[PDB]
């Protein structure tokens, strides 16, 4: 009677509907805002956004498990996939990307055992997880601090989970949060349950939005909040069927993901508006190099601002030239001074210019 | 059927089914956010065009709910002067009612950080009744009624006696200024509660819908209305009064009213989606045709057709319509319409040339 899946009412999850109401409506409000932004920006800006988020998705869902991808390989593969400008094929990165893209692009298709087996084969080409040989593309046949249900139960538990999942008879955000917790508690594979469960979240949200591109990443939010994530899973797996606290945690993670996406799209459009306004500005290569470095840090900027010393670390020019070129950038309204050595920050081009 | 709702022993403690309303609120927030995200992302000029159009709908429709039928051109002319837009028609003497009505609507959405007070309501009421009369009847203006409560819909409802109105309003305003509940619920409750009190001799509907505007502006922190619940209420006028249920509402359970109110909000948002889509189609058209050579007549006609949006003119643009808008001969119209097809501005709205008509060749993303 220690684990949730031993509970007499398993797997009939329930929650405090009156309490969740204001969390869900506030989540829908920011989700709608992001969707309204994406609908209005042009296709070039959306494709750049898509490229950034997909690289974060791959990197962060891997980092959650302690696996650190070559980001250059990730970016290069995404650029080829999306048709953007710009090595050996990295089988693990391609398989991870193929799983993530199947989950958001084929959202009209049901989640089936065969489809999960394909995701699992995409993550484990060699049949090994580190040193350990595992079962690939099939449910575990043995035991995976948490004890998951015994393996003789796993095939039925998964049939119930999937019959429930494909009904879509609940608010889409709740289905995402329930599906993630339920899948994790079953741990149906020998390994890869974390990445596949987060791909299930992606599938659920793509079905909810009817949107075949993820413009935000829950993995990036989970990774940012990883300590609470593990604490909350640990509490839930020892709890009863009232998963109110898990769902509040999950909706807050969703909101964090949307807010990170607001910041990204705001940074992308701030930069392009800046360069529309200043392509008429005469600048030499060094000034253009330094402005791009600072613009890519976005609204948050450099901690101390741009300084003469940082300018000479990036350009390798003399202090006198950096000092004068920085004043030149102030005069041309590209930079503006900060407040107690001199420091500068981007002068943003806000609204129409 | 035995007692008015304001005689109920639990008045004014409205309640509703939180579980049933949850999915309506979540759905409403989603489309509200979508509109707000669009508004945040379009440029300033586009947002201002949207503002001017919604504000004319707000003025015309909140008046039409009461059987007061405004000249839309006058409203547009007054809005264009206030928002610094290109002049609409020759500047004629002002209609004090239109300017007061606009003053009220703009105060409700722009000064959203200020509380609602009796003094503020009196100012709105003075703006609506500048002559001191409601038609033939002299009425109490800029003060609560001292007696008992056209195309206006009559409802046989009895509001509280005037000796109680000031106390009832103080209770209502103390609740209103707490801002202690979900903004959409607050807008729905505020409007129902105000309507049931009928605090003024006349003007209660228009002031009650301005209170909705104030509430939504406070919810959104947005000093411009980009959608209009009056325009939605106008499409369902009869159900509006029915759903208010003034006669036979009876209990303090307002679940059905709040669900209706949330549906009207969503209708208003869905209408704004269509409007902003039409506005952006036009600006996108003029971006592509900024280099297209056109004379002033062709530009006048295209602007008139583009202002009809995707739906277009009934029957499309015709030769005769071209000559009614330009005062040109038929042969000049044949050449200029042909020229506009050649330059990809217009396209044949029919496949048959016996009768010929044209529509805008839209420029998609």
Numbering used by the authors:
A (entry chain B): 4 to 89, 94 to 151, 165 to 360, 364 to 376
B (entry chain A): 3 to 151, 159 to 374
Pull verbatim passages from the article behind this deposition.
Here, we identify the protein product of CBU_0822, in the following referred to as Coxiella burnetii Fic enzyme 2 (CbFic2), as a DNA-binding protein and AMP-transferase that AMPylates Histone H3 at S10 and S28. We show that CbFic2 acts as a bifunctional enzyme, both capable of AMPylation as well as deAMPylation, and is regulated by the binding of DNA via a C-terminal helix-turn-helix domain. According to sequence analysis using SMART including outlier homologs and PFAM domains, it encompasses a conserved Fic domain (115–223 aa, Fic motif HPFDDGNGRIGR 205–216 aa) with N-terminal inhibitory helix (TSAIEG, 62–67 aa), an N-terminal domain of unknown function (DUF4172 domain, 4–85 aa) and a C-terminal helix-turn-helix (HTH) domain (304–362 aa) of the DeoR family. We propose that CbFic2 performs AMPylation in its monomeric state, switching to a deAMPylating dimer upon DNA binding.
In the asymmetric unit of the crystal, CbFic2 is present as a symmetrical homodimer which, according to the program PISA52, is the only probable assembly and is predicted to be stable. According to an analysis by PDBsum53, residues S22 and S26 interact across the interface. The crystal structure reveals the predicted HTH domain to be a 2-stranded winged HTH domain where the tri-helical HTH motif is followed by a β-hairpin wing. PDBeFold55 analysis of the HTH domain of crystallized CbFic2 revealed structural similarity (Q-score >0.48) albeit low sequence similarity (%seq < 18%) to Z-DNA-binding (ZDB) proteins, which belong to the same subclass of wHTH domains as proteins of the DeoR family. A structural superimposition of CbFic2’s HTH domain with the B-DNA-binding human transcription factor E2F4 and the Z-DNA-binding domain hZαADAR1 of human double-stranded RNA-specific adenosine deaminase ADAR1 reveals that this tyrosine is not present at the conserved position in CbFic2, but moved by one helix turn toward the N-terminus (Y341), similar to the tyrosine in E2F4 but with a different rotation. Looking at the dimerization interface of CbFic2’s crystal structure, high salt conditions would destroy the polar and electrostatic interaction as well as the hydrogen bonds involved in the interface. However, AlphaFold prediction of CbFic2 results in five models, which show flexibility in the orientation of the HTH domain in relation to the Fic and DUF domain, communicated by a kink in the long connecting helix between the HTH and Fic domains.
